[PDB]
Amino acid sequence: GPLDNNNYGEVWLPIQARPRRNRKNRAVRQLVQENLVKPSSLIYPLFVHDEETSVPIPSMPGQSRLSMEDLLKEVGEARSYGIKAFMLFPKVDDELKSVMAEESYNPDGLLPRAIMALKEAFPDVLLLADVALDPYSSMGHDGVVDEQSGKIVNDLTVHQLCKQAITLARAGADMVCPSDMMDGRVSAIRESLDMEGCTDTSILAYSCKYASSFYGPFRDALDSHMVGGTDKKTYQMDPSNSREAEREAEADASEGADMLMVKPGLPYLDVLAKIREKSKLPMVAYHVSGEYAMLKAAAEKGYISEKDTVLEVLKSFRRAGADAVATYYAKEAAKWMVEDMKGTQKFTEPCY
């Protein structure tokens, strides 16, 4: 057979290469560790509403629709842990929503005020605002829906997204994040931004955004579910498709985007890796609302250890090729990191 004995009579498989040697102990694993997670690689998305008091999002346990005041307190808490990049979503008062979504470019709207207020209080902090009409749409769609046809009209939607993007830019958004999946919108937004003097303002293109069923809880957060049994499969991508992602990614880099987003997250790590291999831009992954609920719900019932699994997920995103990760665990992960770094350092060390 294949087994021999060694000089001392012990069983010996004479294989030369032994991969387990590089797993021998922590010091060796650390020497060869290929990927690292840090707090300033995490994006923390928050929800603000135009009310006096915060309200839990029951389907996103531990996250809330924050008042302006609790928004400031939350950003400040996250910075104390080394989070620097924040994503802002508004739960718009229902009376303001419409088919055309004109509230999206109202300079006195909730979102611009919040950006203005976070910036006054934390001038060095980094603000990403979503560009898309669904939070402002009475139909629950990211673009304008045609009365007669029911189609999400591409080009008319882009005209609007441009107006929103400039408003957010002017309020102080560092980065606008078109999550709308309309054809051609990166270039259009880019040109408008630039004509207005906002050449500094970045675009995080949602390039490869799938028509997922993992967005449930975010739509609760925003009360932004689609009306009347309609879906977004005429604009968000078919999860059956990878090749198509290259089509979209190539188009967004050449239209001027600063970073590409892949969304959702863990169930699309293959797409993340594929675009990362081909793109020369930074990549961002979005650990979406549904993915967060899955973790919390299993953690709440004791099925998994919350801390170990969240840290494993973030390392995975990072291994799969994400330069940054938008995650509702952003604050909690940084906190765990800073507490270990201050305690016994069971799993952390410094980096630069």
Q: Tell me which residues touch Cl ion (CB under 5 A).
A: 18, 20-21, 82, 311, 347
228 forms part of the interface with a copy of itself (CB under 8 A): no
Does the annotation count 233 as an active-site position? no
115 vs 121: CA distance, rounded Å: 10
The single residue of 84, 91, 97, 263 carrying the catalytic annotation is 263
168 vs 214: CA distance, rounded Å: 27
45 vs 129: CA distance, rounded Å: 10
How far is residue 162 from each of residues 100, 154, 277, measured CA to CA in Å? 13, 13, 30
Q: Which stretch binds Mg ion (CB under 5 A): 8-16, 44-52, 245-253, 339-347?
A: 245-253
Could you tell me the smallest distance in angstroms from the CB atom of residue 218 to ligand PBG? 3
Single-letter amino acid, residue 238: D
248 forms part of the interface with Mg ion (CB under 5 A): yes
Return the structure tokens found at 180: 């709308």
Strand partners for 326: 43, 286
52 forms part of the interface with a copy of itself (CB under 8 A): no
87, 133, 248, 329: which one binds a copy of itself (CB under 8 A): 248
- Identify what 134 binds: a copy of itself, ligand PBG, Mg ion, none; CB under 5 to 8 Å per kind: ligand PBG
DSSP secondary structure of 126-161? EEEEEE-SGGGBSSS-SS-B-TTT--B-HHHHHHHH
65, 174, 177, 179: which one binds a copy of itself (CB under 8 A): 174
50, 51, 93, 340: which one binds a copy of itself (CB under 8 A): 340
Does the annotation count 24 as an active-site position? no
- For residues 328 and 60, the answer to whether their CB atoms sit within 8 Å is yes
Q: Which stretch binds a copy of itself (CB under 8 A): 6-14, 47-55, 65-73, 92-100?
A: 6-14
| Token pair 């387990």: residue | 20
Nearer to Mg ion, 174 or 248 (CB): 248
Q: Give the residue numbers marked as catalytic.
A: 209, 263
